[model samples]
Each structure stands twice: as structure tokens, then as C-alpha cells.
Target: TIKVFTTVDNINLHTQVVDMSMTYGQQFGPTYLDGADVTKIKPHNSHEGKTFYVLPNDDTLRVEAFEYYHTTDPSFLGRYMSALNHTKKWKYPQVNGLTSIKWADNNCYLATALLTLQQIELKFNPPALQDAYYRARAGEAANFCALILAYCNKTVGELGDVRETMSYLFQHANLDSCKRVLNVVCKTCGQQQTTLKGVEAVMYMGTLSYEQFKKGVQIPCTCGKQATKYLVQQESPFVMMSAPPAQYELKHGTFTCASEYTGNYQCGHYKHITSKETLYCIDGALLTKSSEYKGPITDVFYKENSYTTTIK
Candidate 1:
């Protein structure tokens, strides 16, 4: 299952969009009228219909979305890992393609955090479970850093050289904040691990005490499901990106797949062809399904061919 998790803070989103627009405007000047277009590229209602594992009991916490698939494909894991790995190495790339747009270092940090989460989902195993847990924690840490960067951008009007923002965020972790973070983290990590059966027999990581778990515990789900509490034996320092075996690699380019197709092609060619078009094998004959060209076509062709082909 494909799962996604994000905050559902309208104020935060607005602040982030405004900050992006201003930053892009200042960097691109009048050349880019819609400075925040990049940020707006995300789908409207993208968070809808997706399961949101959130700490509903926590007043300050909210989950935007969570999606998951139940496939055991190695290629899926590999792609997920690739995305994570690429995100880990994210630095402010030169804004050459979109001139005059200066990239923010904090954006890279957010990407890294997301990638780390993907890695945890990909490399979750029995022997390597601890490492996965630590990486998950690291992703949370990186998310905290991103949150600080966002707050700074919203409040300070720009991402100035604020070295102590992270420190400040860490220090401001009150009981409420701690509960919110821990609940959301546990929900996300728990869902992933449970789906993969990573911690079926073993206990949860880091030997967290019942008190620690209960300190800021909030039962957010109304499904009447109790939290699967566990305790770790020892604690270790959290690392953002683990080694290759545990790290997720991020796929740099966009991934496109054909949603629908109709053509005559041999069965053997199904795995070989990379185009989004579908192929069909009719009566031992191979036929490559081509995309419909623009302009009007006959009603019969539209019904039989053009309407049948779909690209995702």
C-alpha cells in the first residue's frame, strides 16, 4: 500500500504558500508573475480519501493524508529506496532552469525528511528493524527542522541565517508538543511496520518505557483500537540516512505509466515495452497500440480507439 502523511494545518499551508510566493517574486522579479506556482503544483484536495493516521486526541496535531499499497514487488521497494537516497543528498541546486529563483536550503531538508520516511518503509526487516526505527526517528527530526524553517519564513519574512531555530524548536517541545510528535510518529511508523510484519514477535524499538509512552499518549483513532505498546532495551543516537542496505534511494526523474491501452502485441513484449501505450496480441499477431493524435477523428475511431487509450 502507498501511504502518505502530512499536517492538516490550513494556517501553516497559507503561510508556506505566501512565503514561497514572496521568495520567488524577490528572486525572479517581474519575470515570474506567479511566484508561488511551483508550490501550487500540488493537487487540490490531494489529502482527501487517503487514510490519515493522526493523533486526533492531540489538539495541536493533525494528519493530512496517508496512502498505502499491499504489493510485495521488489521493484517497488527499490524505487521507493531510490527516491529516499536521492532525497538524502538534496542540496540547493542552482536555479538554472527557472532563472532568478533562488532555492532554499530548508526545502532540501524537507525533501530529505520525506526520503528518510520512504527508506524506513522500504528497508523494514527483522534484523534491520532497529536501524529502520532510528531512521524513522531521524526523519522526524528533519521534519522538525523543516517546520522551524517554515515558521521562520512565515514570521521573519525570509529565511535568514537563523542558526538557532532548530535549537529553539527542540527546546520548545512542551508536553503537548511531545505528545503530538510521538503520537503521529508512532502512528505512521506503526502502520508501516505492521503492514510489513516487521515487529510481529519482537518489541518496539529503543526500549521506551511505559511511562514515556504514556506521558503524552493520545488515542486519536476512533476505531476503538488500542495502541500496541512496546519497550526497547537500549537507546542509540538517531541518524538521518543509514547505509545502502538500509537507506532508500530516490528516483530522480518522473515516473509515468499507462493507465489503459488497447493494441495487438505478443505477450512477451509486455515487459519489454516502456511506452505508456498498451499492446494487444490478437490471433498470434503483434500490434503496438499508438496514442491518438490531436484533431477530430471519426466517431467509430473515437469509440473504438481514441477513447480506449489512457495515459497516467
Candidate 2:
């Protein structure tokens, strides 16, 4: 079963979205409310039926196939080493794509603190059971995808561990900062903005505990639930394009990706291909006399120790 865990604040907010009926009781993620915080852990009124394993509190956890953290036979050292591997939620591109996109991000790491997570997932004998756990995580699958990108031709980068990610975002974050808005494309149908909220969320990444981040944005897609596609980080007017079809997409720079021009907008714009009558972009958008014709707004989230797709 696909299990998910989030803060006490989100138990209900995300409940209606995932297959909670089967995994709620077994899922693991964000947990508990701090005493100073006002968002109390309310009744599970939001949880109408089944329950798997929603983390109930700071100390509420199970290791080794649902064994209580407090009572398990494994040594604390052994238990501590089982949460950091790349486990089941993986794909060929996401892993291979790491080197390709790291330079695109303004990569950062507190070397001493970063590799601690590596130890968290090392001892799970079967190896497949290993999944690194961070006090503030961005979901194994989501963060890996966010950890890479290329724009304005600058190499992007993402920290492997959530702690490293949260460190960068918290220092640079701003409220309603459009830079944090990640545009997602639909891989299933190969389109932009076709599902729920179309790949957008506020103060999402590295926003909480550190106001820790949530476990990636869950948007609806033509096939079903899919995550972000192109994660756009505004490069400022830091650099401009030599012409349209530039490496990075800027607000008022130019238009690329028309049904005709190139037939594809590379670097995270959904299958890198477009074929439509009209399209749009981020801002100061307009139809240029010389244009590629694909909408600039084809693709486009957050934070605690966080991290896809950019659009036409």
C-alpha cells in the first residue's frame, strides 16, 4: 500500500487526496504539534474509516515492519541506520538525472550535517527496505526530482538530504515569493496545467519545523495523481536571452516552443514538446511578431529542508 504521513495540521487536509483508507494507519511522515503552536491535533473526524499508521506524536513511531521504536529488538544504532536509502519510490531518470541537473541548482551542503542521513538508511538488511528519514523531509521521491534542473543555461543543483535543502531555502525564502512557485507538467497526458492547481503550492518547501516542508505537492492529473513536472526557480533578470528559445525562461524575455518553431521546449517543459493553437507565459506576456508559438506558461512549489517542471 502507498502510505503517506504529514503534520498534525495536515492530517485532514491531505486525507481526502491519497488512498488513506488503506494506508493511514501504516503511513509515516510529519507528526505532532509543538506546545507553542496553535494548530492542535484535532479529532480524527477527518479520518472517517480505515487507519494504518499516521504518526501520532513526536515519540510515536514503529521500526522494522511496524515494530514500535521503543520496544523493537534492534539496537538503537541499527534502527538509526535504516531510513536513508533510495528504497522503492525510484525511477531511472530521477537517479541518472542527478548529475545532469545538480549544477542548475545553486547547490549547498553543510558537509558535516549532510551525510548523517546516509547513516539513517544503511542497515536494513534486505536493502530494499531502506529509506532515509529526516526530521524534516521532502519525501524521497519528490526531493530527488526537485534536486535537479537546468535554466538560463546555468547548471542547477539539489541537496541529497532534506537537512541540506532546508538550510538553503529557509535562508533565502520570502513570503509569496513567486520564485517558490514550481510549475508542473502532466507526464501522463503530455500537457501543461491539466490537473489540480496545475503544480502549485505556497510556502510548501522548507517552510515548516523549520516550519518543515510537506511531502511534495500532490496534484491531480489526467491519468490520476502525479507530482510536479518542471520546477522553475526565477533567475531574476539575472541574465537575458540572445533571442527566443533561450536556455532559461524569463518573465518578459521572449517566447519559445510554438507548434512550429522548435516543436519542443527543452529543460523541463513537459516531454519538451508542444503542439497547440495558443499558449502563455509567466508575466509581461504577449504575442511577439517573431515567436515559437508554444505558450510560455506551460509549466511551473516550496520548503523545510527542501525542492520540477517549467513550462511553455
Candidate 3:
């Protein structure tokens, strides 16, 4: 027998049309008529002899309904019913002309399992049932395990153990599977943004140069711990001593204390010895040589400690 499966809405109307067509097509064999044929059934205008009507006291409609209720195909009817039940219980339909039965009949094993899981969780604490539902939906068994662990961690406060479970999932679950689990979890619990301080510690170390090292080094004062102290110390004048000047000769000439050159008279040049001896002298005055200085000088004529009154 060719079993014809259809929605309950059109069953009654369809049976009548098929029975009426039997008269023309030879009554001994099976016949099929869709819901459209039943609604449109009437006496034909061109063929005055033909008539269309429901078969009186026929049991085809009843049998069809019975088969629909009893049939169990894990892929089709099973999933459909499961989904319908879940939708009806958890997210109840509010729209006009919407029915859970219709949804359950359309989706099979997958939908049915989902719905059953939802309804079961609503009334009872069935972790196993929930796990089964997730496993059925998951692409791999590891993904299912991850979801179970995550759910347990959230609902039962087993968060400490969640990491192990998540790691396992990450290893075994594909990107799509992980995303699905994450989406569901995010919907249930608002997602949180985590701020990590030592993330760089775990990052792979790359080649470093001198400049890079200098830039990357956490300067003692600028680092978080001593920043305030460094700031306090920086609010003062920082003075650095200027480098000493280099010297160059301005002019060179023979010098003497007296203007007249009296070399014949008894004239003796006495050498003075002291710790603070004037290294160079000219015109009875101490003069620092340009060669002794290391940098430029503004005035080279004046001695460092010589008194103008005494010299004059």
C-alpha cells in the first residue's frame, strides 16, 4: 500500500474527493486525491454524467489519522513532534492561526528532541536529558561534552571545572559547533568582556633590537608602581654645569713692567713659588693661556684671580 502522509487540516476534505473519483476510474483499485481535488469537487459542466462527493461511511480518513499518530521515523516524525512540544511549552505561540501540532508534524527527530529537552527541563532538573539533546544537535561528541560542561558550570555553579571542559571542546569541536554553543550561552547569560593584565607574558617573543629594548623597557619611574614618586621629583629645577671653555691666543707680544728697556742696569727676574702660582704673566699681571682652555672663551684679557687695583 502506498501510504500518503498529509496534514490533518486537509484530511477530511481529501478523502471525499478520492472516493467519488473511484466510480469513473474502476472501483476495485486504490485511488489518490489531494485536498485541492476535494474542495473543488463538483458536477462537471462538460460531462453531465460525472458527479463528485465524499464516500459515505468510509474509514480512510480515520486510518490516516491513526497512522500519523503512531508512525515513528527518527529523522522525520520523531524530530517534528519533539520540536513542536518544546515550542509549545517554553515559547508558547501567541500568533493567530499558529499551532504547535503543525510545527511538530513538519520537523522530525531533531526538532522533536529539542522540544522534548526544553519541556523536560522546564518541569524537572534533567541534566542527562539536556545532555542528550545537545549531543544529538552537536556535530561531534566532544562538542556535546563542552556544552554539557558549560551548562553545568553556569546552572550548577561548577565554574572551576568549566575550563577543562571548554579546553576539551575547543580541541574536539569544530568552529561552527563552538560558535553554536557560545551563541546559546550568550543568549542565556549576558556576555562579559574580560580584561587581562599579563597577556603579553604568554605571547611569543620576537627578535629584539637595542632601540626596541630601550623603548620597551619599563622605566623604573614611569612604571605603575613609582609613577607618582617620579612625578613629584620632576617638579623642580634641574641644573647642569656648563662645560669649561677652550682658549685661543688673541695677541702675542713681548711684555715688561717698565716701559723703558733698561737691560744694562742690575735687573734680576725673581721667580715666585707658591701653591697658587700664576702659570702665565704678562705686563706684571697673571694671564691664562689660550692653549690651557678646552672650549671657546668670551674674555681672554683678564686673569682668573688678579686684582685690577694691585696691578695698576
**TM per candidate:** 0.18, 0.18, 0.13
- Model 1 per-residue lDDT at 35: 14
RMSD in Å for model 2: 21.5
**Highest lDDT model number:** 2
| Model 1 global lDDT (CA atoms, 0 to 1) | 0.24
Residue 291 in candidate 2 has what lDDT? 29
Q: How much does candidate 2 score in TM-score?
A: 0.18
Please provide, for model 3 over 35-59, each residue's C-alpha lDDT reduced to its tens digit, 9 standing for 90 to 100: 1132333223332322322222245
Write one digit per residue (lDDT tens) for candidate 1, span 123-212. 322222223334435432222232333333322122232112322322322211111112222444453111111121111222222233
Worst 10-residue lDDT window for candidate 2 reads 146-155
Which stretches of model 3 miss by more than 4 angstroms?
1-75, 92-312
TM-score of candidate 3 versus the correct structure, residues matched by position = 0.13
* Deviation of model 1 at 265, angstroms: 65
RMSD in Å for all candidates = 24.7, 21.5, 41.7
